[PDB]
Write a protein that binds this ligand. Structure first.
Ligand SMILES: NC[C@H]1O[C@H](O[C@H]2[C@H](O)[C@@H](O[C@H]3O[C@H](CO)[C@@H](O)[C@H](N)[C@H]3O)[C@H](N)C[C@@H]2N)[C@H](O)[C@@H](O)[C@@H]1O
Ligand SMILES: Nc1ncnc2c1ncn2[C@@H]1O[C@H](COP(=O)(O)OP(=O)(O)O)[C@@H](O)[C@H]1O
Ligand SMILES: [Mg+2]
Ligand SMILES: [Mg+2]
Length: 263
């Protein structure tokens, strides 16, 4: 248990000036490798999350599968060293969505980007998708996290509208209100922190440990959540739906939003 990376990987990143990310809120460790000819990225999770949607090991699988289907990083190196899952990947092409609009009067551009991701997602053949993240599987995983204290139940940034007075109240609810599901490709954590844009078009997706099959409303819900907080104006949510060309199923949007609360 040397705590981190193997020798080989150490040699591989030597040439680069390692810069530790400070944005990622997951349990994973992220490092930007500032190189001469390019930039590389190293992401790693410890053994506690092995098997879970946090496991970069799983993230690596989806990264490989999605190649030639979505703009994802190139899997440059992967290893399981000392109970850790370490992934070396290519820098996402484009500009981090969040950064690209971090301060602009571009509400419409954001919404457009979100709707493009959704349509784009729907066009992906999940017939051979490595993982399935159905509600059943997710709740089983949530249950696991809570039992092993792998979830931050006290100090997380919760929605101002989450009723529940404790973890199990919410778990129970999710377990009781499971909505009907209609599998489609799902990112798992669709936000301006995991999406890249270029020339006003999506150019890349990262953070894939939670990708796989799941209901259509999952990602839709995530977008709505960002939108309502990052651009206060009920009117901009209606536009997002106009672009997706569908009516909102509020009951399901609320559900998937709550589902993400303990992750
Ligand atoms: N625990 C680790 C996870 O922490 C965040 O996830 C949390 C969301 O950030 C919270 O939502 C807040 O941030 C949204 C932007 O996404 C805003 O729209 C919203 N108004 C805010 O309440 C939500 N309540 C809980 C969710 N677990 C990271 O995103 C995710 O990558 C990381 O794995
Ligand atoms: N391949 C990549 N190219 C560019 N930036 C990346 C890449 N991988 C990670 N990052 C950067 O690091 C941040 C955290 O990485 P992410 O995979 O989202 O970890 P977490 O699961 O904690 O959110 C991202 O918001 C992004 O800024
Ligand atoms: Mg992320
Ligand atoms: Mg993540």
């Amino acid at each position: 248990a040397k705590m981190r990376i193997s020798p080989e990987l150490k040699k591989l990143i030597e040439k680069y000036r390692c810069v530790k990310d400070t944005e990622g809120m997951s349990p994973a460790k992220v490092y930007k490798l500032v190189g001469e000819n390019e930039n590389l990225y190293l992401k790693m999770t410890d053994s506690r999350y092995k098997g879970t949607t946090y496991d970069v090991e799983r993230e690596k699988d989806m990264m490989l599968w999605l190649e030639g289907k979505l703009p994802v990083p190139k899997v440059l190196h992967f290893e399981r060293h000392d109970g850790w899952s370490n992934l070396l990947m290519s820098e996402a092409d484009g500009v981090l969505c969040s950064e690209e609009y971090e301060d602009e009067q571009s509400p419409e551009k954001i919404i457009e980007l979100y709707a493009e991701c959704i349509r784009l997602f729907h066009s992906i053949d999940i017939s051979d998708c490595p993982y399935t993240n159905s509600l059943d599987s997710r709740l089983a995983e949530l249950d696991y996290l809570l039992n092993n204290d792998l979830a931050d139940v006290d100090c997380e940034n919760w929605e101002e509208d989450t009723p529940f007075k404790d973890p199990r109240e919410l778990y129970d609810f999710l377990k009781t209100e499971k909505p009907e599901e209609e599998l489609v490709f799902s990112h798992g954590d669709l936000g301006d922190s995991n999406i890249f844009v270029k020339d006003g078009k999506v150019s890349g997706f990262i953070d894939l440990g939670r990708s796989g099959r799941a209901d259509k409303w999952y990602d839709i819900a995530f977008c709505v959540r960002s939108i309502r907080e990052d651009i206060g104006e009920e009117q901009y949510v209606e536009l997002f739906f106009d672009l997706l060309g569908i009516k909102p199923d509020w009951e399901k949007i609320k559900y998937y939003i709550l589902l993400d609360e303990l992750f």
